[PDB]
Amino acid sequence: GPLLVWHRGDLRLHDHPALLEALARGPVVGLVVLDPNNLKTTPRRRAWFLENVRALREAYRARGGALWVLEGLPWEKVPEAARRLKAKAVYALTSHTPYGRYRDGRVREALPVPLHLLPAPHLLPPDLPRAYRVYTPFSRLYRGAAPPLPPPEALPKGPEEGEIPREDPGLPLPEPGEEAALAGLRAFLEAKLPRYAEERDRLDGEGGSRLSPYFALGVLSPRLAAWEAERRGGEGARKWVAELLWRDFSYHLLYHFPWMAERPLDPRFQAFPWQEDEALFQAWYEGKTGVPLVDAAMRELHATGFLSNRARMNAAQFAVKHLLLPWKRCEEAFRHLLLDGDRAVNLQGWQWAGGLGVDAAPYFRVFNPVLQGERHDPEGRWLKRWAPEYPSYAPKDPVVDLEEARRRYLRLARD
Ligand SMILES: Cc1cc2nc3c(=O)[nH]c(=O)nc-3n(C[C@H](O)[C@H](O)[C@H](O)COP(=O)(O)OP(=O)(O)OC[C@H]3O[C@@H](n4cnc5c(N)ncnc54)[C@H](O)[C@@H]3O)c2cc1C
Numbered sequence: 001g002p003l004l005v006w007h008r009g010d011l012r013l014h015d016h017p018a019l020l021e022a023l024a025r026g027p028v029v030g031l032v033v034l035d036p037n038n039l040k041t042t043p044r045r046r047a048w049f050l051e052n053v054r055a056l057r058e059a060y061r062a063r064g065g066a067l068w069v070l071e072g073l074p075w076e077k078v079p080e081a082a083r084r085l086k087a088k089a090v091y092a093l094t095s096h097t098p099y100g101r102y103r104d105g106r107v108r109e110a111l112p113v114p115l116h117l118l119p120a121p122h123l124l125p126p127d128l129p130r131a132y133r134v135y136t137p138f139s140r141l142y143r144g145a146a147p148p149l150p151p152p153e154a155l156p157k158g159p160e161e162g163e164i165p166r167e168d169p170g171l172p173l174p175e176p177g178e179e180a181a182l183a184g185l186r187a188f189l190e191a192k193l194p195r196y197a198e199e200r201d202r203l204d205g206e207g208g209s210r211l212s213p214y215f216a217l218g219v220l221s222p223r224l225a226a227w228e229a230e231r232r233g234g235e236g237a238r239k240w241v242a243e244l245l246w247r248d249f250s251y252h253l254l255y256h257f258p259w260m261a262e263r264p265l266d267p268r269f270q271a272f273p274w275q276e277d278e279a280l281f282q283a284w285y286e287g288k289t290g291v292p293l294v295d296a297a298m299r300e301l302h303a304t305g306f307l308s309n310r311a312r313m314n315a316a317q318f319a320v321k322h323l324l325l326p327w328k329r330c331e332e333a334f335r336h337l338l339l340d341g342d343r344a345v346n347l348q349g350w351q352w353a354g355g356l357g358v359d360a361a362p363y364f365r366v367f368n369p370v371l372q373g374e375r376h377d378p379e380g381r382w383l384k385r386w387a388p389e390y391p392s393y394a395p396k397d398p399v400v401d402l403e404e405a406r407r408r409y410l411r412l413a414r415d
């Protein structure tokens with residue numbers, strides 16, 4: 001009987017502990033389950049997921065292996081596949097998310113054979129004993145990347161079942177799959193890594209790898225990426241790996257402070273006067289605030305599904321501080337428009353840029369919509385491509401008075 005390798009947010013063959021753990025014991029058959037709990041989202045994210053699943057199957061086929069794709073509830077579909085294949089056991093990577101744990105417990109209950117969960121590759125585990133709310137102390141535990149596991153050269157033959165639906169993303173998607181992701185990593189490392197420290201703040205984010213969409217679905221292992229960068233070494237590598245750590249820090253936070261998905265890490269903001277005005281929300285959501293920066297950011301987001309880190313922190317803070325729009329609603333809408341939309345990461349990003357308790361970031365730090373745009377964008381070429389209308393980062397009829405909205409926040413914040 002074969003061993004089933006169940007892929008979730010790990011659509012890759014490189015550095016995959018569950019895949020090798022099973023392969024070492026005997027023939028394997030891969031499996032992906034299209035779960036309504038994950039697929040019932042915006043078209044752009046559903047398609048991104050589906051296309052990477054299609055790419056995984058091709059990767060299995062190219063090696064002579066078999067990848068099944070079933071649709072439905074994991075606790076019904078995994079056992080079904082196990083029965084049909086007469087599998088001896090099921091192997092997967094551990095998931096520490098609320099849904100992940102609920103789902104896997106249900107599957108374990110329905111499964112008549114063992115379900116073996118292995119640690120997913122990380123730079124720093126999220127379930128670390130000590131709980132840190134600040135990044136620096138957390139990052140000090142990192143002692144370099146462990147070596148990544150190799151991909152199999154060829155795969156044992158087996159039967160293939162299931163069809164992979166085709167969805168209209170409603171926009172241009174990056175090239176799906178591990179091969180594409182690996183080529184991107186190489187390029188970035190050979191060309192951009194060297195100056196990353198000096199180019200990682202551009203508003204158009206072209207100094208970065210643009211690999212987040214792949215990381216989000218596990219198409220690329222963070223351990224492999226870090227290991228590669230560290231082989232290059234230098235200031236660039238040090239700083240870039242530090243960013244990868246931020247991703248792990250994000251999972252660490254949500255793991256130790258689950259309640260932060262509900263309320264700010266910083267208790268003194270549990271009762272901030274969030275003014276839920278449906279009119280302002282659309283203005284922000286649509287990028288019609290009048291502020292060149294925020295507007296161009298939200299317009300690129302709606303069109304591309306991607307946005308640089310610098311752009312995200314502005315657009316995110318503007319909504320929280322300059323408009324006092326509640327974060328809960330804003331972070332959800334934000335996540336849904338992102339190809340790399342990751343619950344834990346997006347949440348820490350908002351509770352950080354929003355001065356809500358992450359990394360003890362101070363509330364008094366308030367971005368200046370125009371300065372930011374001139375200090376992080378040359379001939380305003382970025383603003384030109386996404387908001388041609390605006391002559392410059394000059395507030396041409398703001399939906400609120402910037403200077404006022406600022407003092408308004410600072411005022412409220414001091415309590
Ligand atoms: C309000 C807000 C919301 C965000 N929501 C998300 C989200 O839902 N999903 C997501 O992947 N990123 C999110 N980010 C973090 C971040 O902006 C991106 O990971 C980054 O822009 C990706 O571009 P890149 O791949 O070129 O990154 P690079 O600069 O090339 O960095 C490489 C990798 O490190 C990780 N990384 C980099 N910066 C951060 C960071 N600040 N926090 C966590 N991980 C980081 C990413 O996986 C990234 O692909 C958010 C940031 C903010 C301020």
Ligand SMILES: Cc1c[nH]c(=O)[nH]c1=O
Pocket residue numbers: 246309313348349352353
């Ligand atoms: C959390 C965080 C810290 N620093 C950044 O530049 N971006 C982020 O999202």
